[PDB]
mmCIF file of C-alpha atoms in Angstrom:
data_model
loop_
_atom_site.group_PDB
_atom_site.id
_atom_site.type_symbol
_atom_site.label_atom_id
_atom_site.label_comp_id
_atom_site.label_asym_id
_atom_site.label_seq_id
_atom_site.Cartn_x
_atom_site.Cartn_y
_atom_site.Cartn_z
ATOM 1 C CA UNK A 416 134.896 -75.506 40.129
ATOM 2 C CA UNK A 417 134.146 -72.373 42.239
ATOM 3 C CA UNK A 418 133.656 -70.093 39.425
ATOM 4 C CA UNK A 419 135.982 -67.098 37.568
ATOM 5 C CA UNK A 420 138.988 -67.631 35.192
ATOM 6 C CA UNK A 421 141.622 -70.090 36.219
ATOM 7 C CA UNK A 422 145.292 -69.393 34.710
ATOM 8 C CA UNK A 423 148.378 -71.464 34.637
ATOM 9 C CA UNK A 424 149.929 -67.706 35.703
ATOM 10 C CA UNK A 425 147.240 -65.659 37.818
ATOM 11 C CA UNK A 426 148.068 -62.150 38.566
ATOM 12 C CA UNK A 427 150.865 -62.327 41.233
ATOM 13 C CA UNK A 428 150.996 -62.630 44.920
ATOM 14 C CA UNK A 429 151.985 -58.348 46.170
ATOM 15 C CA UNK A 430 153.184 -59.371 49.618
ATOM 16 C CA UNK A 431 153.864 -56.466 52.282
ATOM 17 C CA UNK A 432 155.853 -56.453 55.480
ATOM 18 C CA UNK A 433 156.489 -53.332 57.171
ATOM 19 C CA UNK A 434 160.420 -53.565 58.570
ATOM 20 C CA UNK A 435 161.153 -54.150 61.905
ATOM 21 C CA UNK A 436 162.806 -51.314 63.933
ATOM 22 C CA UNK A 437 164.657 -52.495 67.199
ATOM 23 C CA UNK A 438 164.534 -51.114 70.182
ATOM 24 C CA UNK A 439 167.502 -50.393 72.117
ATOM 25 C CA UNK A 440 170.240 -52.996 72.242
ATOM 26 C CA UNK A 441 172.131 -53.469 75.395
ATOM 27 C CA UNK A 442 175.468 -51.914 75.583
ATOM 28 C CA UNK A 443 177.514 -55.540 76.181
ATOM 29 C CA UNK A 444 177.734 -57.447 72.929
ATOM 30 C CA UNK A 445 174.766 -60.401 73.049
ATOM 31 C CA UNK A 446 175.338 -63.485 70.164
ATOM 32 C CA UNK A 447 171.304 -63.869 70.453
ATOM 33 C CA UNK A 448 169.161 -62.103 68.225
ATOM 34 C CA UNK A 449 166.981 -59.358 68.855
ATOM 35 C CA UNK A 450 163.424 -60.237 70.215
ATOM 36 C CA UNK A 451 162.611 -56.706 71.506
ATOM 37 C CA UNK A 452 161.114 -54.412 69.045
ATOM 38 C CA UNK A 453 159.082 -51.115 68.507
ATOM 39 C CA UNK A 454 154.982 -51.252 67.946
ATOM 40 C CA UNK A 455 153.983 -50.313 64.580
ATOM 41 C CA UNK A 456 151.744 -50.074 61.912
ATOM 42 C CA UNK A 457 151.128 -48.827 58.251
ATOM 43 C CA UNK A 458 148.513 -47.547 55.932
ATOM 44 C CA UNK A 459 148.254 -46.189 52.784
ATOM 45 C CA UNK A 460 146.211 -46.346 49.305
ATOM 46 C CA UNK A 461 145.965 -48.674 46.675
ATOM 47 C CA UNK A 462 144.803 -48.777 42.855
ATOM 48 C CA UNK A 463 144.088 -50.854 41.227
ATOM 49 C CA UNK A 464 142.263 -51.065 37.622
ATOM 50 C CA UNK A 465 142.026 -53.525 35.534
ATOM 51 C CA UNK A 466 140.696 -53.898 31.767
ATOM 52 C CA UNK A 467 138.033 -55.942 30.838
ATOM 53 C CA UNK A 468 136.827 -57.676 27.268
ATOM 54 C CA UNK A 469 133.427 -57.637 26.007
ATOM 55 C CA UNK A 470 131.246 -59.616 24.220
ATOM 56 C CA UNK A 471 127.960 -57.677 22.995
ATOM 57 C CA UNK A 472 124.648 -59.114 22.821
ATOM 58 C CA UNK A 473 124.078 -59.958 18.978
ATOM 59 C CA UNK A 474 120.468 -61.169 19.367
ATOM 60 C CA UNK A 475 117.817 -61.356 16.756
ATOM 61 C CA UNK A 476 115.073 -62.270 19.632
ATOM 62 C CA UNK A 477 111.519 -60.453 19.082
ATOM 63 C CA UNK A 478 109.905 -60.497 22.625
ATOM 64 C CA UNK A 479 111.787 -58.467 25.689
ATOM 65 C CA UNK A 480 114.619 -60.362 27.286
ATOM 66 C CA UNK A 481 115.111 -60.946 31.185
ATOM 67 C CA UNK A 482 116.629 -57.941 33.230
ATOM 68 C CA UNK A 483 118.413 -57.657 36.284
ATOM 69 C CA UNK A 484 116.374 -54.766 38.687
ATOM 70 C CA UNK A 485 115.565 -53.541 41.892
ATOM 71 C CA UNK A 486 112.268 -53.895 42.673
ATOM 72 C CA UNK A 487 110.223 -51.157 42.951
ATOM 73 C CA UNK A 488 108.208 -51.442 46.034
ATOM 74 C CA UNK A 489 109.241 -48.924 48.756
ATOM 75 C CA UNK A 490 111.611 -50.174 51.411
ATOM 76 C CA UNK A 491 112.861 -49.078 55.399
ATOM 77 C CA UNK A 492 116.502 -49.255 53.481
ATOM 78 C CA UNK A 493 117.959 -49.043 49.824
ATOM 79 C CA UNK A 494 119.623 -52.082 48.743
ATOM 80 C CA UNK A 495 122.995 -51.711 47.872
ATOM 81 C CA UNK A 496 122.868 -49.049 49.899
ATOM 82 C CA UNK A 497 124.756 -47.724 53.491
ATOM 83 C CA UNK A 498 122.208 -48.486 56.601
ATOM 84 C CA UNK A 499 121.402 -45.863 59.484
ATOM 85 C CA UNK A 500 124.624 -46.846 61.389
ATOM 86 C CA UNK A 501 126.338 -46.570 58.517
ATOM 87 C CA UNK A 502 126.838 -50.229 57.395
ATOM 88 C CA UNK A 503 126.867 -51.221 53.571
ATOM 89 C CA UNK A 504 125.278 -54.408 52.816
ATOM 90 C CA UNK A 505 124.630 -56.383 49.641
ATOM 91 C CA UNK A 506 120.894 -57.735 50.400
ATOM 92 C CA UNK A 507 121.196 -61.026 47.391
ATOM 93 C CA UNK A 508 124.060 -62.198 45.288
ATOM 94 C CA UNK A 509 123.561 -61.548 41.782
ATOM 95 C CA UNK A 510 124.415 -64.111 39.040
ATOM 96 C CA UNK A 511 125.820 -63.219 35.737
ATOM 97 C CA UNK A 512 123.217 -64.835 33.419
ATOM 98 C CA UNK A 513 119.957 -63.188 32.260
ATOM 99 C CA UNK A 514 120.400 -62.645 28.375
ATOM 100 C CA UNK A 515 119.700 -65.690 26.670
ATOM 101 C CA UNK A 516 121.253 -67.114 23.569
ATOM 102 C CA UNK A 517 120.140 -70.455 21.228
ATOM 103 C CA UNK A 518 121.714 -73.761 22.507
ATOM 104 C CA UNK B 1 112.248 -51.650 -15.195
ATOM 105 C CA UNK B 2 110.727 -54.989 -16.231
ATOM 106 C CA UNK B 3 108.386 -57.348 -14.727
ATOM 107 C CA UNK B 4 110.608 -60.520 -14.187
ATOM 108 C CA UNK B 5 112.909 -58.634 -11.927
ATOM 109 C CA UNK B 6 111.958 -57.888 -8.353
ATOM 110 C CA UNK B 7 112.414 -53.668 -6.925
ATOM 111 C CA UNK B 8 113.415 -54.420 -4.138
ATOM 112 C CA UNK B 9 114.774 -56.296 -0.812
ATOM 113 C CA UNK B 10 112.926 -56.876 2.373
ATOM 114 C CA UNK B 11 115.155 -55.191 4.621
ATOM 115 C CA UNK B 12 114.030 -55.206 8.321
ATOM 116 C CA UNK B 13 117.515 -55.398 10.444
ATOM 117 C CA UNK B 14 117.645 -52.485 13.067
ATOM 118 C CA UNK B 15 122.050 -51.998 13.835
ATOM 119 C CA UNK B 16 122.557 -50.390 17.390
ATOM 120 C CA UNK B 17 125.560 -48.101 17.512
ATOM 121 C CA UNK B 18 127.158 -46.082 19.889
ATOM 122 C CA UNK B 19 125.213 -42.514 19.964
ATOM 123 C CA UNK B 20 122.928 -43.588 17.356
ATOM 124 C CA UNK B 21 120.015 -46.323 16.174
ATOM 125 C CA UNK B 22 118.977 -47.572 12.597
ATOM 126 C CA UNK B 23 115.901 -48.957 12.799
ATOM 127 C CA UNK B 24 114.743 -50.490 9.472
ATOM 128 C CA UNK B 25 111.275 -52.273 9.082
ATOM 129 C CA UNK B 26 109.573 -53.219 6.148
ATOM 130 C CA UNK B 27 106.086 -54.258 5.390
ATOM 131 C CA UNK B 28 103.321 -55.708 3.513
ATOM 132 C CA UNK B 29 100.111 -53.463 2.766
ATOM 133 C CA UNK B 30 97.131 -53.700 0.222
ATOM 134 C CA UNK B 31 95.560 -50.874 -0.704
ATOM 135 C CA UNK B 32 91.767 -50.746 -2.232
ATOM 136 C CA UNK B 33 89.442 -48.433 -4.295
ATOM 137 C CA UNK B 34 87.712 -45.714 -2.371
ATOM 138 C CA UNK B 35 84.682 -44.175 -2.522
ATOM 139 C CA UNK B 36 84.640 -45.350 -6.027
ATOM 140 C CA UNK B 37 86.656 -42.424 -7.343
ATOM 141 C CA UNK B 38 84.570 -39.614 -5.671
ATOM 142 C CA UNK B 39 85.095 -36.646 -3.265
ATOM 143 C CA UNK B 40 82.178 -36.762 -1.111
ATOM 144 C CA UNK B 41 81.375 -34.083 1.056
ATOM 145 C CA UNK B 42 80.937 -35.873 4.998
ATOM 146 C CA UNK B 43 79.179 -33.879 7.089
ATOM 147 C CA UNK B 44 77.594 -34.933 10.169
ATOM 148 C CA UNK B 45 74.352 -34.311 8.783
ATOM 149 C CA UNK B 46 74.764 -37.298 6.546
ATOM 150 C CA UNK B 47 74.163 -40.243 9.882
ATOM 151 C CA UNK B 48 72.835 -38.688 12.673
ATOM 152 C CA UNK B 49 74.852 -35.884 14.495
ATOM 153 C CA UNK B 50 72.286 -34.226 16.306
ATOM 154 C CA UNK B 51 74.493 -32.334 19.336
ATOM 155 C CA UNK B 52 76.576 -29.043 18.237
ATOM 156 C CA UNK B 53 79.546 -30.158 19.680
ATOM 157 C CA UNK B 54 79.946 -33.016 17.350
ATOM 158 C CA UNK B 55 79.083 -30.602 14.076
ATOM 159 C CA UNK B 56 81.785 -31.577 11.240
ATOM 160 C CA UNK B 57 82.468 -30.734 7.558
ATOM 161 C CA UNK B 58 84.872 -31.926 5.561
ATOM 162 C CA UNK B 59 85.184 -34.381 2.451
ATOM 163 C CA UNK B 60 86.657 -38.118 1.830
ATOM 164 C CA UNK B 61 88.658 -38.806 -0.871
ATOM 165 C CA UNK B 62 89.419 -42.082 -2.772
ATOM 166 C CA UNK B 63 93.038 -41.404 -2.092
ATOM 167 C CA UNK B 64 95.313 -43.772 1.204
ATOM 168 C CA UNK B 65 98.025 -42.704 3.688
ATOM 169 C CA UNK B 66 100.614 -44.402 5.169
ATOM 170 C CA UNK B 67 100.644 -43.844 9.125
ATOM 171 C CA UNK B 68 103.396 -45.088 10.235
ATOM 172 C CA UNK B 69 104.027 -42.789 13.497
ATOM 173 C CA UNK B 70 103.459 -44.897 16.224
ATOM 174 C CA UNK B 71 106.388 -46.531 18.230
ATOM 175 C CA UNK B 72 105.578 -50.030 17.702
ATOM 176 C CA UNK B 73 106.039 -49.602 14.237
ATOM 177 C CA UNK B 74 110.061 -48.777 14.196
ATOM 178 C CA UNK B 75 110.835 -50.878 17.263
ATOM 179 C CA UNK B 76 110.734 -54.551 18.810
ATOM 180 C CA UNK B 77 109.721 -55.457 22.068
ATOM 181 C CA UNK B 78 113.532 -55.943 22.527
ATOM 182 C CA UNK B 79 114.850 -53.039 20.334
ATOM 183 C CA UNK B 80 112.649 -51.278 23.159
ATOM 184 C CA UNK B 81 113.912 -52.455 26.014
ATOM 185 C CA UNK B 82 117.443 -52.435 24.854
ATOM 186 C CA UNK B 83 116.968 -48.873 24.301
ATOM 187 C CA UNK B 84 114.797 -47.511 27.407
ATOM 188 C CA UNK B 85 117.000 -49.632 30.021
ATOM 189 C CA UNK B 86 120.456 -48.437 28.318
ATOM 190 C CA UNK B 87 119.524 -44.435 27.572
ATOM 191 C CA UNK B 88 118.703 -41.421 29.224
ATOM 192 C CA UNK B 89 116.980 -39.516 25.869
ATOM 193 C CA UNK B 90 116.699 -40.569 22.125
ATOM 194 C CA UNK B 91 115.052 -38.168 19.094
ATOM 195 C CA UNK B 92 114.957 -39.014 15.640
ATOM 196 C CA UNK B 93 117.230 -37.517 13.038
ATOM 197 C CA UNK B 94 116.430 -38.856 9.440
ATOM 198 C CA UNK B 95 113.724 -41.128 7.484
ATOM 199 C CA UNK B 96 113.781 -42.901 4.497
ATOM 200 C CA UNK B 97 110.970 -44.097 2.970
ATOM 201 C CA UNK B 98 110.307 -47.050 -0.007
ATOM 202 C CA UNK B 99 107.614 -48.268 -2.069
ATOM 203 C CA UNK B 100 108.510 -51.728 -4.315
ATOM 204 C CA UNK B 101 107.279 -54.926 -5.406
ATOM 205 C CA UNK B 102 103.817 -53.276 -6.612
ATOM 206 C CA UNK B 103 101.127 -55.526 -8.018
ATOM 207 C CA UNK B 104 98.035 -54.447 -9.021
#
């Protein structure tokens, strides 16, 4: 109801837990379990690409469709673009339908 | 080959691929008599022409051209903007040319 592609079998959950390293035990034996452990963190890169389907526009129309552009007019900022501070912001969400087809 | 049978098609489909365009058009035209068979000699001398600048000789003949060789001509409003929006440079590379369906 949201939008996108629903799937009886998405793409799958990639969980990630980074272990947990102790820190020291105490030299008598204790039955309880460890609470104490070391501060740490992870980082790293990830990929990923996927591979999209196309349909191509097959239209017969005459006159000039509907585009998607930015407008012209000159701006403090480009849209789509990083600010001063260095900030990246989207300025309007863009919808998916411009070209038209027959009903 | 025989008058019952038709020369030719109207073709005017225009097929977009990948590095290249085919843009097919096809039209209907009516040509007339000119100058009633003649060469004439037009000068400016003829009407008028009374400033250097616009001095001219030449002659008219009762033959007709095609001009095709503006854009409009080979492209839709659409066929345009599909190709201005989508491309960074475009040339032409061959031309084919018919006549058919005379009737005189």
């Amino acid at each position: 109801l949201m939008g996108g592609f629903g799937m009886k079998h998405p793409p799958p959950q990639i969980l990630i837990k980074n272990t947990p390293v102790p820190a020291d035990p105490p030299t008598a034996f204790n039955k309880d379990k460890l609470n104490s452990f070391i501060t740490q963190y992870s980082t790293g890169q990830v990929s990923v690409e996927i591979e999209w389907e196309l349909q191509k526009e097959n239209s017969k129309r005459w006159n000039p469709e509907i585009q998607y552009t930015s407008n012209y007019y000159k701006s403090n900022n480009v849209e789509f673009a990083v600010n001063t501070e260095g900030v990246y912001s989207e300025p309007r969400p863009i919808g998916t339908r411009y070209l038209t087809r027959n009903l | 080959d025989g008058v019952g049978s038709s020369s030719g098609n109207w073709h005017c489909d225009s097929q977009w691929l990948g590095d290249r365009v085919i843009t097919t058009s096809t039209r209907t035209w009516a040509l007339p008599t000119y100058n009633n068979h003649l060469y004439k000699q037009i000068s400016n001398s003829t009407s008028g022409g009374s400033s250097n600048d616009n001095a001219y000789f030449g002659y008219s003949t009762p033959w007709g051209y095609f001009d095709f060789n503006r854009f409009h001509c080979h492209f839709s409003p659409r066929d345009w903007q599909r190709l201005i929006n989508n491309n960074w440079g475009f040339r032409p590379k061959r031309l084919n040319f018919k006549l058919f369906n005379i009737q005189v």
